RNA sequence: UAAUUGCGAUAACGAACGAGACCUUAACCUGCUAAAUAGCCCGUAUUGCCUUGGCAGUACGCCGGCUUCUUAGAGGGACUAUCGGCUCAAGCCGAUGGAAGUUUGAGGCAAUAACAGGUCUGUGAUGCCCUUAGAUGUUCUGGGCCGCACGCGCGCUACACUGACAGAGCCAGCGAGUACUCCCUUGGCCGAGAGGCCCGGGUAAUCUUGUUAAACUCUGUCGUGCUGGGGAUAGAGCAUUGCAAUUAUUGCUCUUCAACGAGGAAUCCCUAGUAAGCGCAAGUCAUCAGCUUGCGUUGAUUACGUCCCUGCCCUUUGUACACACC
C-alpha cells in the first residue's frame, strides 16, 4: 500500500497552495479536492484525499521537512 | 381448525390415500402392469403390487397443487439418469402410454376433468373434496 | 381525432445517445399535456462468440470471447395517430425506431 | 421481417461491405472512413 | 403448537442438545484447552463458517463439525454433509449404550489421549536422514488425532459385513482407554518409538 | 517418566531445512524463573502449552 | 391501519422474500406449515431462531415466506436469514425497541451471521475451476 | 463364510436365552455371531419386536438398532 | 552402460 | 491517410528512409504529441528485417492506445516482393 | 513494497516506456427517476375445511394504491477511516465499526531487443521455379484417410455396504428458436420402447420455460460371494435422418455376463465456494460427445513458510567461453 508521484506531487501541491481551507478530517478534504481541481476518478479523488489528510495531522504536532506553506 | 394437503406429511399421505383407494376398488386396468418398464432408464418392474394405485394417489395429490399440466410436464416429472454403458450418463424421461393412460382412467372416477380451453387436465369441484376428506381422517390420527 | 395508444420500441448499441433521445421526447411529450407512461427499463441483451486465438493450432492453445450488447428503452403513449408524427422528429445517428399504432 | 437481434449483425456486415470496397476503390483520394445513417424509404452516405 | 412437543421438553432448560447435555466437562489435564472450542453448544454439527481464511481462526471452531468434516474422504464422499451427520449422530447414540457415561464425555477423552508428543523430522543429510525428533504443538496433535480415528473406520469398514455407524463408534469407545488394539494407537506409539530411536 | 509441562514465551524467527520446525524460549510454569530454547514442529502462539518428555537436551543457537 | 413489514433475504442462488403481519401468533413457510419444508436431518436448523428468544414474544405475529432458486441447504438458510430482519424490523418499526436491543444483542452474540449475508460464488477460467490440464513432459 | 438361509432349533434356542443379556442387537452382531444370513437377521428384528422384549432407540431405512426392555 | 555427455565430472 | 501517402512515394523510386522521415515533419506541424511509423520486409538483402521510427510521447498499456491512438497498415508490391507498413498518431 | 513502489543520501539535472493509473464484471442502497412483455397490497366473483372473525387456492381490475422482492439509468459508498503497541520518515502487525480491510475478488490490455519457432494447405497477401489440353486446373463414379503381432499421451466407466436396486419427496443458472422453407416446440390421440398422427403458440422478460436437471432426502429389497458391483464382446427384432447407413450413423427390447480387490519404478494439478462429486447450455451438426468453451447445485483436510531439488531477479567476483558449458 504505497502511494505514487502522481498522488505525491499533487497533495504537496495542494497543501503548499491552500493550507488553511481544510483540516485534519478527511471527509472535509474529500469535498474540498474535487471542487477546486480537476480529477479523471473518484478512487484517484479518494487517493490523494486520503493521504493529504494524513499530512495535517502529523504537520499539527511538530514542523516536517520538504512541506512549507504560507 | 380445518385441514388440507398442505398440512400433512407427504409420504403418509399418499399411502393412507393408498389405503383408502384400496376400499373403493374400482379403476380400470388394461393389462399393462407387470409387463411395463415405467420408465426407459429404468430395468425393472416395482415390486410392490400395487404401483398403479399408489402413483394415481401421488398423480392426484400433485395435481391438486399444480394449475395446469399434461403428459408431456409428467414425462420428465418422473424421469431419471439412465446407465447408457461406459458413457456418462445423462437425464431421459419415463415411459409415455403408462403416464398418459394411468391418469387418463383418473377422471372418470371423477376426481379431475379436461381443460381444453387452454390444455392440459385441472381438478374438479368434488374430485377436490376427496382428498380434503382425507385430510381429517389423517390430521386427528396423530 | 382518434386516439389509438401507439408505442414505440427502439434499439442501439450504445447507451448514452438513446438515453438523451428518450429524455428530450419526455419534455416534448409532457408540454402538450399527453398523459406520458414512464421509460419502462428492459433487459439488456448480452451475446458473446468464442473461436480460437491462433490461426494454426501450434504452440500454446489459448481463447478469446468477443461480445455485443443490445437495448431496447420501449416506450409508449397515448395520443391520436397524426400527432405522433411530428413529435418523433430530430433523431441522431444510429438509434432505430419502429412505431407501432396498436390501434 | 427478420429479428433484431439478426438485424444488428447484418447491418454490421452491411457497413463492412462498404467499408472493404471503398480501400480497393478510393485509396488514391485520400479515404479515411465513412459513417452511414439509415432512414425509412431512402438512406444517405 | 408451533414448535414440536420434543423441543418444547428442551426450551424450558437452558440450551444443549437435544439428546445429551454440554455439561460436566471433563477435569483431566491441560494445554489442549483454549483449542477446543466447547463453551457455544450447537444443535447440528452443519454450518457455513469462515475458518479457512486466517491461521488460527480454525482453532475456536466446534469439534463435532471437525470430526464430520474429516468423515467424508477418499474421493466419493465429498461435501456430503448430509449423509456424514447422521452417520456422527449415530455414532454418538451407539457409543451411549455400552456405557452410561455422556458419548461426549467418551469423545472429548479419545481425543485428549490419542495425541502424539513426538514426531521426527525430516533434515537433509545427501541421501540420509538426520532425524532430530522434534515435539508437536497441541493444534497439529489433535489434528493428526482426527485423521487417525477417521482413517481408521474407513480401513476397517472397507469390505466388510459391519456397517460404518458402529464402526466409527468402536474405535471411539476402544480409544477412551488405553486399549492398545486400535490402529490409531499402533501409529501413534510406532510413531514415538521412531522418535526415541532418532533422538 | 517425569513428563514435565513447559509454555512458550517468544518466537525467535523459523529455523529448519524446511520451515517446518521453529525454534522457541519456552518457561516450565513450575520455575518461573528458569527458560531455555527448544524447536517445535507445529504452529505456535503466544502463550501457548507445550508437553515435554525430556528438557535437559537443547537446540542451536 | 394494518401494522405490516416486508424483508427479504438471499443466498448463492436462492431468494426468500417474507411478509410479516400482526395476526395471531401462526407460522408457516411456502403456504405449508413448518413441518414439512426442509430436510429431516437439517429441520434442526429452522427452529433455534425461535426457541432462543422465545415462543412468548410471538404472541400476534404472522408470516409468510416465498422462497425460489438455488439448492436444498440455500433455500433454509435464505429463510433462517430472513426471518431475522421480519422479527428485528417489525419491532423496531411498531413497538418500543427496549425489546429491540436486547434480541438483537443476544441473538448476534450466538451468531453474527443472523443480520449479514455471506457472499460466495463461483469463477470463471478458461481450464474448470482452478487446475489446468495434464502436462505431457512438464 | 456362509451362512444360514433356514433357523432351525439350535439356533432358535440362542435367541430367547440370550437376547435377554445382549446390551444391542443388530444385523451385524447377529451375522457375526449367530452365523445367520442378513435377510434372516432383518426377519429376526421384526418378529421379536411384537414379542415385547426389545425396545426401539432409533429406526432408519439403512441401519435399525434395539435394546434390552 | 551411461551415456558420457552433458559435460559431467568425475 | 499518410499510410497512403508513403506507399505512393515509396512505390515510385525513393529512398525508404527519407519517405520515412517526411512523414514525421509533415505530422509535426499538424499539432500531434508524438508518432510511430514501423516498415518491414526486405531491406536491399536476402535476409528480411524492420525499421522502426518514433518521435513524441507513446502508450502501449491501456485501454487509451484502444481510442488516443489511431493506427492503419499497409501492403506494397515491389518488384521484388512485399513490404509492409504500420502507422500510428497519438491525437490529444 | 507485489513492483526501477517509495523514503532518502548523492556528479548529476531534467525527461520518455513498463508497473500503477485505466476499462468490464462480481459484492452495498427500505434514498432519486420508473415499470400489465416483472411483482406486491387492495377490491369483486368463486372453491374447500373449521365454521371465526379464520386458513388454503382460482379468475378478473389497465388511472384503486405502491416498487421491498425482478430490471438498469443518474449518483453515493473504502480511504486503510478510528484506536493500541514499534519507527524521524516510508511502512508493518492487532482490534472495533462497517455489505466490503490481500491492490475488496477475478479478468481485458500490456515495454526494448530478439527465435533461421509455426503458417505459401485461410486469404484475388506474395518472389522465384514447375505442370499448363495425354492437365498438378475443374468435374462425375467407386474405394481409402477407421486398415493391425507392438511401445507412448489427454480422457470416460469401475473394482462395491461411505454400495446397488425399487417406490415416494423435490430445488438452479448462463443460453438458443420460424425460410423463399419449416427452426426450438405446448396441448390431444395412437403406440411396450424408440416413435407416429392432429389443432395451436413464439421472429421471442409475452410461447417453448418455473426449461420443477443431477446430486440429494424418506421408506423398502439384496447381504461381501469378484454376487443383484462391473458392462467388454456377440445373436435376433423394431424405428427415425439422408441421394445413399455394408466396415452396422444413431435409438429401443430380449439374450450372451469377459477383464477388473485401490495398482511397481516413475509422474501431473491445486490455497475458499477453492479441490473433488454431479449436471446443464453453446460450438462442429440432416443424425452422432467419451471433445472444448461457459453456467449453476452440494462443498472439504493441512500451510500462511523456506530456497533443499527444478527455475527466476539484483550486486560483488573468476574465466584460455562470444556458434557463448550441448
Ligand atoms: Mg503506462
Ligand atoms: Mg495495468
Ligand atoms: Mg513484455
Ligand atoms: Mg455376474
Ligand atoms: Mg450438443
Ligand atoms: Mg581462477
Ligand atoms: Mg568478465
Known amino acids: 500500500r504505497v502511494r505514487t508521484k502522481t498522488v505525491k506531487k499533487s497533495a504537496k501541491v495542494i497543501i503548499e497552495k491552500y493550507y488553511p481551507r481544510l483540516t485534519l478530517d478527511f471527509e472535509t478534504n474529500k469535498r474540498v479536492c474535487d471542487e477546486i481541481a480537476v480529477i479523471s476518478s473518484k478512487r484517484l479523488r479518494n487517493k490523494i484525499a486520503g493521504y493529504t489528510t494524513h499530512l495535517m495531522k502529523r504537520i499539527q504536532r511538530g514542523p516536517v521537512r520538504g512541506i512549507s506553506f504560507k | ?142 | 381525432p382518434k386516439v389509438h395508444k401507439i408505442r414505440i420500441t427502439l434499439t442501439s448499441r450504445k447507451v448514452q445517445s438513446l438515453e438523451k433521445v428518450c429524455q428530450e421526447l419526455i419534455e416534448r411529450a409532457k408540454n402538450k399535456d399527453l398523459r406520458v407512461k414512464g421509460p419502462v427499463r428492459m433487459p439488456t441483451k448480452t451475446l458473446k462468440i468464442t473461436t480460437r486465438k491462433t490461426p494454426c493450432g501450434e504452440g500454446s492453445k489459448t481463447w478469446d470471447a468477443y461480445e455485443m450488447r443490445i437495448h431496447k428503452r420501449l416506450i409508449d403513449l397515448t395520443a391520436p395517430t397524426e400527432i405522433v408524427k411530428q413529435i418523433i422528429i430530430n433523431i441522431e445517428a444510429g438509434v432505430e425506431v419502429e412505431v407501432t399504432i396498436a390501434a | 421481417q427478420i429479428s433484431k437481434k439478426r438485424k444488428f449483425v447484418a447491418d454490421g456486415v452491411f457497413y463492412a461491405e462498404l467499408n472493404e470496397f471503398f480501400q480497393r476503390e478510393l485509396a488514391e483520394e485520400g479515404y479515411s472512413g465513412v459513417e452511414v445513417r439509415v432512414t425509412p424509404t431512402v438512406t444517405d452516405i | 403448537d408451533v414448535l414440536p412437543k420434543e423441543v418444547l421438553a428442551e426450551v424450558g432448560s437452558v440450551k444443549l442438545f437435544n439428546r445429551w447435555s454440554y455439561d460436566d466437562i471433563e477435569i483431566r489435564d491441560i494445554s489442549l484447552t483454549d483449542y477446543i472450542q466447547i463453551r457455544a453448544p450447537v444443535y447440528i454439527p452443519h454450518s457455513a463458517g469462515r475458518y479457512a481464511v486466517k491461521r488460527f481462526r480454525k482453532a475456536n471452531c466446534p469439534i463435532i463439525e471437525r470430526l464430520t468434516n474429516s468423515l467424508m474422504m477418499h474421493g466419493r464422499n465429498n461435501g456430503k454433509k448430509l449423509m456424514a451427520v447422521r452417520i456422527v449422530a449415530h455414532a454418538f447414540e451407539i457409543i451411549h449404550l455400552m456405557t452410561d457415561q455422556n458419548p461426549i464425555q467418551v469423545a472429548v477423552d479419545a481425543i485428549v489421549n490419542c495425541g502424539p508428543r513426538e514426531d521426527s523430522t525430516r533434515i537433509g543429510s545427501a541421501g540420509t536422514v538426520r532425524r532430530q525428533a522434534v515435539d508437536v504443538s497441541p493444534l497439529r496433535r489433535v489434528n493428526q488425532a482426527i485423521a487417525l480415528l477417521t482413517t481408521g473406520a474407513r480401513e476397517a469398514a472397507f469390505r466388510n459385513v459391519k456397517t460404518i455407524a458402529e464402526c466409527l463408534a468402536e474405535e471411539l469407545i476402544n480409544a477412551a482407554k488405553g486399549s492398545s488394539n486400535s490402529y490409531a494407537i499402533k501409529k501413534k506409539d510406532e510413531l514415538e518409538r521412531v522418535a526415541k530411536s532418532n533422538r | 517418566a517425569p513428563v514435565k509441562f513447559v509454555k512458550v514465551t517468544r518466537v525467535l524467527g523459523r529455523t529448519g531445512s524446511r520451515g517446518g520446525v521453529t525454534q522457541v524460549r519456552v518457561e516450565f510454569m513450575d520455575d518461573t524463573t528458569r527458560s531455555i530454547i527448544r524447536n517445535v514442529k507445529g504452529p505456535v502462539r503466544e502463550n501457548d502449552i507445550l508437553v515435554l518428555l525430556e528438557s535437559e537436551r537443547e537446540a542451536r543457537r | 391501519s394494518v401494522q405490516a413489514v416486508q424483508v427479504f433475504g438471499k443466498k448463492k442462488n436462492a431468494t426468500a422474500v417474507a411478509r410479516c403481519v400482526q395476526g395471531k401468533g401462526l407460522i408457516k413457510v411456502n403456504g405449508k406449515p413448518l413441518k414439512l419444508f426442509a430436510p429431516e436431518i437439517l429441520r434442526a436448523k429452522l427452529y433455534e431462531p425461535i426457541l432462543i428468544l422465545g415462543t412468548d414474544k410471538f404472541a400476534d405475529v404472522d408470516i409468510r415466506i416465498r422462497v425460489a432458486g438455488g439448492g436444498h441447504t440455500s433455500q433454509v438458510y435464505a429463510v433462517r436469514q430472513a426471518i431475522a430482519k421480519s422479527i428485528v424490523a417489525y419491532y423496531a418499526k411498531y413497538v418500543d425497541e427496549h425489546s429491540k436491543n436486547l434480541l438483537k444483542q443476544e441473538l448476534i452474540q450466538f451468531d453474527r451471521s443472523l443480520l449479514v449475508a455471506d457472499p460466495r460464488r463461483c469463477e470463471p477460467k478458461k481450464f474448470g475451476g482452478r487446475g489446468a490440464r495434464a502436462r505431457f513432459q512438464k | 463364510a456362509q451362512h444360514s438361509v433356514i433357523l432351525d432349533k439350535a439356533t432358535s434356542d440362542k435367541l430367547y436365552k440370550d437376547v435377554q443379556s445382549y446390551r444391542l442387537v443388530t444385523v451385524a452382531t447377529l451375522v457375526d455371531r449367530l452365523k445367520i444370513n442378513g435377510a434372516l437377521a432383518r426377519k429376526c428384528l421384526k418378529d421379536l419386536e411384537e414379542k415385547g422384549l426389545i425396545r426401539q432407540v432409533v429406526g432408519h431405512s439403512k441401519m435399525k438398532i434395539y435394546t434390552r426392555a | 552402460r551411461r551415456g558420457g555427455f552433458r559435460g559431467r565430472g568425475k | 491517410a499518410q499510410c497512403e501517402s508513403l506507399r505512393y512515394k515509396l512505390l515510385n523510386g525513393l529512398a525508404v528512409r527519407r519517405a520515412c522521415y517526411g512523414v514525421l515533419r509533415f505530422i509535426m506541424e499538424s499539432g500531434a504529441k508524438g508518432c510511430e511509423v514501423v516498415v518491414s520486409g526486405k531491406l536491399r538483402a536476402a535476409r528480411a528485417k524492420s525499421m522502426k521510427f518514433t518521435d513524441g510521447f507513446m502508450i502501449h498499456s491501456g485501454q487509451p492506445a484502444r481510442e488516443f491512438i489511431d493506427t492503419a497498415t499497409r501492403h506494397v508490391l515491389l518488384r521484388q516482393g512485399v513490404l509492409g507498413i504500420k502507422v500510428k498518431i497519438m491525437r490529444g
Open chain 2, 1 to 142: 381448525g380445518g385441514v388440507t394437503v398442505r398440512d400433512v406429511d407427504a409420504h403418509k399421505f399418499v399411502a393412507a390415500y393408498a389405503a383408502f383407494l384400496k376400499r373403493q376398488g374400482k379403476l380400470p386396468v388394461p393389462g399393462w402392469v407387470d409387463t411395463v418398464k415405467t420408465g426407459n432408464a429404468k430395468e425393472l418392474p416395482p415390486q410392490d403390487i400395487d404401483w398403479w394405485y399408489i402413483r394415481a394417489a401421488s398423480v392426484a395429490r400433485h395435481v391438486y397443487l399444480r394449475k395446469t399440466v399434461g403428459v408431456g410436464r409428467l414425462r420428465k416429472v418422473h424421469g431419471s439418469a439412465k446407465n447408457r454403458g461406459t458413457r456418462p450418463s445423462h437425464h431421459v424421461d419415463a415411459s409415455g402410454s403408462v403416464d398418459r393412460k394411468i391418469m387418463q382412467a383418473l377422471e372418470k372416477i371423477q376426481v379431475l376433468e379436461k381443460d381444453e380451453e387452454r390444455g392440459g387436465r385441472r381438478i374438479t369441484q368434488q374430485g377436490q373434496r376427496d382428498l380434503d376428506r382425507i385430510a381429517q381422517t389423517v390430521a386427528e390420527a396423530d
